[PDB]
């Protein structure tokens, strides 16, 4: 029942701004200080800031003072983070994390006893774009869909409206020089059936409101 | 100044049932204020051990923490599949900043399995847009280290392709890889032989899959 939930992440442009929120439940919010930790894509964890239980003290890492400001509203089981002057360095996944109960006085334990799942902060100069879906034609056989040139993440892929799950590999997307993503989803099937059995990859790019269904054949 | 934490090894590859030993080195004594977290992909990081040696609540006994000062150890005795994740060390002796280790990844060791290799040519549908994408697929291999070399009319290609690797398979413990070489339509129509050459521990020699444009 102890839970923490983050919200407010999205996509912005460099120099853009953002306000993140963390919502606690299952506990007396004001009894603990709250931290933010970030993980840049393909990187480890980095501490960013903390606010005290009472809301009187705050600490920030060198990299973000002047840019981010942390605050809380214990009356609402809530803290927020105003992020200004967003850079590429700030791109990543943001976790709110509870400072373990320092017995106390005016304390901080430095121990992160509960973490949330994270909300995503994307920093880019690219515009939203739906994908172009291309067939990777069979030539046991493999076949697929090349989901290309979209922004932003994520894209969901399914095969035959979800009835086909076996031997499916849907690969992590790569960020192209253009600022757009491109990915591959493939499946292994029997040569016998290429004649009959339709294989369609279903693509949903929710951020752009774009949906594509692609039939792949030899 | 800020305590730099160093984790070793970066990747740890073992089999379920074995004992794992992970280390975290501080740049300066952190006393006993050292914590370990477990992190699974897209899951919330989790507290395992705090104050170097104390098991947090819910954490099973196979997890052991030891150490003092600058050298610390995280031990897991009878590895189970769910212990395969990324483990980070953290310090609370001298902060701010709170500082973390770079992470050690614990991965499943499996027997060597060679990849199935397939090549896919660009679709006509893509060609009318002025770009051509060629895909090379590497299925179900171990270990993770693989090498893909693109060859166009025997010219080795560099810098015009991108690669993505899957996360270790939950049933198989194998990896899969997708590689994409992109070219202008004009360059594509100007060339003839397209090849994906694969190097891997499970292959006695490099596997080449190729097609000739037109066909």
């Amino acid at each position: 029942q102890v839970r923490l939930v983050e919200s407010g992440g999205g996509v912005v442009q460099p120099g853009g701004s953002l306000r993140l929120s963390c919502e606690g439940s299952g506990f007396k919010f004001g009894d603990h200080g709250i931290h933010w930790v970030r993980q840049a894509p393909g990187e480890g964890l980095q501490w960013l800031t903390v606010i005290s239980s009472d809301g009187t003290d705050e600490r920030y890492t060198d990299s973000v003072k002047g840019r981010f400001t942390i605050s809380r509203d214990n009356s609402k089981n809530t803290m927020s983070l105003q992020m200004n002057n967003l850079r590429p360095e700030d791109m990543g996944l943001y976790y709110c994390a509870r400072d373990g109960k320092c017995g106390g006085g005016r304390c901080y334990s430095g121990l992160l006893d509960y973490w949330g799942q994270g909300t995503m902060v994307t920093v880019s100069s690219a515009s939203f774009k739906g994908p172009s879906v291309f067939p990777l034609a069979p030539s046991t056989a493999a076949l697929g869909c090349l989901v290309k040139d979209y922004f932003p993440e994520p894209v969901t892929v399914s095969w035959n409206s979800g009835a086909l799950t076996s031997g499916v590999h849907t690969f992590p997307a790569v960020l192209q020089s253009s600022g757009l993503y491109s990915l591959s989803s493939v499946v292994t099937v029997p040569s016998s059936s290429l004649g009959t059995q339709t294989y369609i990859c279903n693509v949903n790019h929710k951020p752009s409101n774009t949906k594509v269904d692609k039939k792949v054949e030899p | 100044m800020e305590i730099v934490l160093t984790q070793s090894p970066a990747t740890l590859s073992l089999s379920p049932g074995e004992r794992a030993t992970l280390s975290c080195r501080a740049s300066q004594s952190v006393g006993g204020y050292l914590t370990w977290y477990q992190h699974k992909p897209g899951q919330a990081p989790r507290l395992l051990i705090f104050d170097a040696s104390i098991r947090a609540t819910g954490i099973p006994a196979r997890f052991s923490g030891s150490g003092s000062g600058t050298d610390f150890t995280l031990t897991i005795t009878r590895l189970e599949p769910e212990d395969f994740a990324v483990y980070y060390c953290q310090q609370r002796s001298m902060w701010p900043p709170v500082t973390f280790g770079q992470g050690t990844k614990l991965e499943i060791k499996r027997t060597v399995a060679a990849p199935s290799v397939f090549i896919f040519p660009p679709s006509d549908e893509q060609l009318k847009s002025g770009t051509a994408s060629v895909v090379c697929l590497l299925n179900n291999f171990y270990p993770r280290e693989a090498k893909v070399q693109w060859k166009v009319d025997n010219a080795l290609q560099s810098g015009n392709s991108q690669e993505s690797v899957t996360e270790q398979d939950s049933k198989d413990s194998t990896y899969s890889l997708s590689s994409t070489l992109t070219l202008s339509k004009a360059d594509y129509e100007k060339h003839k032989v397209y090849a994906c050459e694969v190097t891997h521990q499970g292959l006695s020699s490099p596997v080449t899959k190729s097609f000739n444009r037109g066909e």
């Binding site: 005290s52 009187t56 003290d57 600490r59 373990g100 109960k101 320092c102 017995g103 106390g104 006085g105 005016r106 304390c107 901080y108 334990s109 430095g110 121990l111 006893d113 | 204020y33 705090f50 104050d51 609540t57 609370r92 002796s93 902060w95 701010p96």
Partner: peptide, 9 residues
């Protein structure tokens, strides 16, 4: 359950 203090204000 309650952890030792490491920082103060």
């Amino acid at each position: 359950t309650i952890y030792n203090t490491t920082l103060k204000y």
